[PDB]
Amino acid sequence: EVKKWNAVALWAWDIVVDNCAICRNHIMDLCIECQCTVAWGVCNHAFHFHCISRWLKTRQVCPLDNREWE
Amino acid sequence: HNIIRQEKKNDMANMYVLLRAVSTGLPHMIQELQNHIHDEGLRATSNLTQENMPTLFVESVLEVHGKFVQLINTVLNGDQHFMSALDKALTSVVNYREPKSVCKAPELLAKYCDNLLKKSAKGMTENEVEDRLTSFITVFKYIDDKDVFQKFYARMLAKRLIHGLSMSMDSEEAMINKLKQACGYEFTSKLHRMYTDMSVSADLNNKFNNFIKNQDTVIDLGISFQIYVLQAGAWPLTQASTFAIPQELEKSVQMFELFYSQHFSGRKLTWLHYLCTGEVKMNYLGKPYVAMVTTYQMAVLLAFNNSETVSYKELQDSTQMNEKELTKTIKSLLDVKMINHDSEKEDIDAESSFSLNMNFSSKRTKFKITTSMQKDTPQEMEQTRSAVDEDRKMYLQAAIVRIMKARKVLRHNALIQEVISQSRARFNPSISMIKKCIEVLIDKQYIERSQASADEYSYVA
């Protein structure tokens, strides 16, 4: 009828280890040019809209996974 | 040399001041006092052995030190030479080891401090706790292999924290502050990360609950859920059974993973099911009973909600759990007699089938399996010692590399001595182990034996 469950979560290989792979800035702070906009991508990776826009216009590939990010 | 063995305080003062007047009177007194204190401390520490009570190993030493310090303050005017001699004499006492026997002193001190912090020690006031631990750190000052104590205390602290068995986080924070002053911040950085993660987990659960309330569609998980989020860098849980989660927990797992992906992007979660525990309610009996069991035990119990009798193959397929731990879990459940083994054989085999115990009766409606984390297994200490040995190997290799690079040219004995100087505080190293590390680094081409002399080593790069 009633069930209670205690669990432990273990995490590694964070994207916030590198934060933006485009710029040298945090996942939450402003970009290099900007310093605003957290644009989530279907690529399961978080980058600034200014970062992903600039480094997608010049190269459609995502540097981390070597494929296309949106 | 005779008059120290049976001493007269006035005579001691007279001979002490007279020897202080002369230039060379002191060293014989210093050495003989060091030897006498060494022998007395060895006699004191050898008095008791394996009497199930570890505080004596601390307490007696304290007393001896106290007695001696009183004397050194009373008639010796607290001369620093005598202070240093007392320190040298007391160094051997704690670092005493039986032949072929490893030094259990760091283990004993870790057990003592853990026992003080455990809720089993009730009626003990916090001020008295911190006074005892102030004495404890003073005793610890004489320990050589701080790394072993560090690892043991880290494991014990993790065990206490995961189950909330500590007095109060202020107490352990004061302890880590005291240890940090004692050996530097580096000695306590991982433990500070541990405490920080423990503190943050509450806000993590709060944010998770806020996300739950903020979902577009109201979700009824059907279970009460609490989870704890752990960093890989400080938690000593590096071991990784292809166990299958029960379907009831799949909804909660998926929704929490979605939460963590949305709020903490790019963080890859890992589940330690063997550590996850939970509350199970049996309603098929005459009274509703409540059990505190692990996820593996819970999965076996839920497998019976669809059939009263389950074969071993069915359980193993439903859980995808390895034979050894599945057998262990089944035996543990059989011990409480919540299930009945349908095969006459005492050994559980592949053909073993198990039936639900409709006749189960317990003195408590809500019951728990005793935490074996408090229990000590001889294998665990040996594994910890092996890990510490590997860490010592790596650190000694590091020290050799740093010294060799800093000098850019050095002798064999000079490298050995500088390694000895660098690692003396961290642990007691050994010459043969240093030579082994040197050979290994030669094999990997960090250093090369000098062409002028094999006793000199030169940096390859």
Place this chain on the structure above:
Amino acid sequence: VHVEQYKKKFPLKFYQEIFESPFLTETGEYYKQEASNLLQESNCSQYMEKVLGRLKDEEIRCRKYLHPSSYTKVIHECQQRMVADHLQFLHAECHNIIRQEKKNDMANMYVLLRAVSTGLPHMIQELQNHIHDEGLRATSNLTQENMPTLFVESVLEVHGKFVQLINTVLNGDQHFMSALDKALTSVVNYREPKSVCKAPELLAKYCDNLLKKSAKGMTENEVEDRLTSFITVFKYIDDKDVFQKFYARMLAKRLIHGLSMSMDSEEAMINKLKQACGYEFT
């Protein structure tokens, strides 16, 4: 080789013209075949182990059989066949290796890639991307509540661990510690904080905490060690002049009110800065 004993010019010409060329050709062909076969099946780490095994066997056999002169050329050909041909594949996978590393695994990257000239510089750049990014995690996570303590220990730990990794593994190649300095220098100076020179003024705050008497304080001997470690951070910091202007102001307030715990401590503080910059800075 001994037949041409008495010829004055080109004594080894017959040896090279009868034996060495076919031996080189067939050994190159054989190791091309072996490299292809191993790459067809092996894993990156296993291929790494097996190429080292083959290169260890080659030295032994060549010492056993051929002339003392011809070791180098055969070894060079063997090197030019295995690692050089598949160098691009090794570069591709190196990204994952550095971000999460096995001590033995990525160590052998240094040994193999050292022989080929062009391969090495790619790795040194990849390390900078990882090491700098990790430091950003250390900084951006810091809380504004107690700033002075956070910077001093955090960046040192990042510096200390990466110093520990680099020398235990990569044979401490000079170029590599240069990569350490450039990335670390970049980290300490950022524009994201609203206040410009936020870190340099916070150094004075950390010094201000040490400028106070702090009767319930730590040992002055280790205090100098903190300052000794503090200077290590100071070198990576660009705006040294801003620090001196701020530092004298709080130093003056500490001195005029006697807030300093000991005059000798300040003298060492002055002395240590002298070897750092000195002259007008001190």
